[PDB]
Copies of this chain bind each other. A is one copy, B any other.
C-alpha cells in the first residue's frame, strides 16, 4: 500500500545535487533505420510510402491515392459522436481558437526620419503537417491544440498524418480533425510519414513544418528533417509542479499529482510546500486514493521513479525552487496566487486557484499560433 516518494529538504547540504538528480532525464540501430526510410521516401516517393505503410501499419492499398481519407469521412465521424463528446470538442476548439486569435501576430510598418519605410510582414506557413498516432491511444486534445492555432494563423493547407493499423480508425481523432479545419488526412505514420511530409511525394504535399508527438521513429525522423522543415520541440514526459500553502484538501493535491502522473510512467509530479504536516497528509491521501485509480500502476510507477515532495522554508523559496525546476505545468494551490505569480519566471502554463517540458520552459514558449506564422523584414527606401 505504501508509495515511496522521494522527499527533499531545502535545508539539506546536498539539496541542489539531489534536485538535479531528481530532475535528470535521458538506438544507433533506430537512427540507421530512420535514415534508410527517409532515403527510401526521397528516392522512390509513393511506391516506397505504400510499401512501408503495408509493412509497419498493416494497411494495404493499391495506389498511394487510396491512403487518403475522403473529407466526407471526417464530417461523418464528427456527425456520429455522442452529443456530449461533440459538445466538449466544440467548446474546447472554441476556447483554443479565441486564445490563438488573441496571440496572432500582425503586419505593420513605420517611417524613419529620412522617409525610409520599415516594416514587419507576417505570413502563415504555406503548409503544415500534423502527426497523430494511430489507434485508440491518441487523444483528440492533441489534434485540437496543434490544428486550431495553425488554422487561426491562416495556414492554407493543413495536412494530417495518422496511421490506420489494419485499417482501424479513431472516430474522435477524425472528428477533431474535422472541426479544427484539417484540410487533408492521410493514413500514414512513422518515419515514412515524416519523410513524405518533409520532402513530398507525388501524392503527399511537401509541408514547411511538422508538429505532433509520435514514437521513437517519428521523433528521430523529425530531428533528421529539421532544416528541410521546422519542427515542434521534442516532448519529454509530462510534468506538474504543485506549490501548496497547506490549505488545500490533500485529497485534491493528490488528484492534481495523479492528473499528470497517470499518462506516462516517466511523468514527473512534484509537490512543494512549506508545511511538513501537509506533505504527510498528501502522502496519506495518495496511498489511500491510489488503489481506486484505473491508471493506478502507471501513477505508482511515475511517483516512485520521478515523483518528489520538497519541504521549503516558505513560499518565496517555493518560487525559487520552481524557477529552478522550470516545470511544464505549474499549479499555485495557495490563497493569494495573483501575488505569488509575480515571483514566477519559468513555467509553461500556470494554473491559479504542446507545453515545454524537461526544463525547456527556461527558454521556450508553448506551441501557439505564432509558431505557424513568420515575419519578414520590409525595407522601402522610398
Contacts and interface: CB of A to CB of B under 8 A. Distances in A.
Contact of A381 (B349, B351, B362): B351
Nearest to A122: B365
Interface stretch (A51-59, A68-76, A131-139, A371-379): A371-379
Contact of A348 (B126, B361, B366, B377): B377
B350 A230 contact: no
Nearest to A351: B379
A229 B361 CA distance: 10
A244 interface: no
Contacts of A123: 345-346
A362 B112 contact: no
Contact of A368 (B95, B112, B125, B375): B375
Given A102-B108, A378-B341, A227 B353 contact: no
A99 interface: yes
B349 A377 contact: yes
A175 B239 CA distance: 44
A305 to B, nearest CB: 20
A382 interface: yes
B121 A364 contact: no
Given A95-B112, A120-B102, A350 B379 contact: yes
B126 A362 contact: yes
Nearest to A356: B374
Contacts of A351: 379-381
Contacts of A362: 125-126, 208, 229
A322 to B, nearest CB: 12
Nearest to A374: B365
Given A341-B378, A348-B376, A376-B349, A102 B95 contact: no
A377 B382 contact: no
Q: Residue among A98, A123, A378 with the most chain B CB within 10 A?
A: A378
A380 B363 contact: no
Contact of A378 (B323, B352, B379): B352
A323 B376 CA distance: 13
A358 interface: yes
B368 A121 contact: no
Interface of A: 95, 98-99, 102-103, 108, 110, 112, 118, 120-121, 123, 125-126, 208-209, 227, 229-230, 234, 323, 337-338, 341, 344-353, 355, 358, 360-366, 368, 374-382
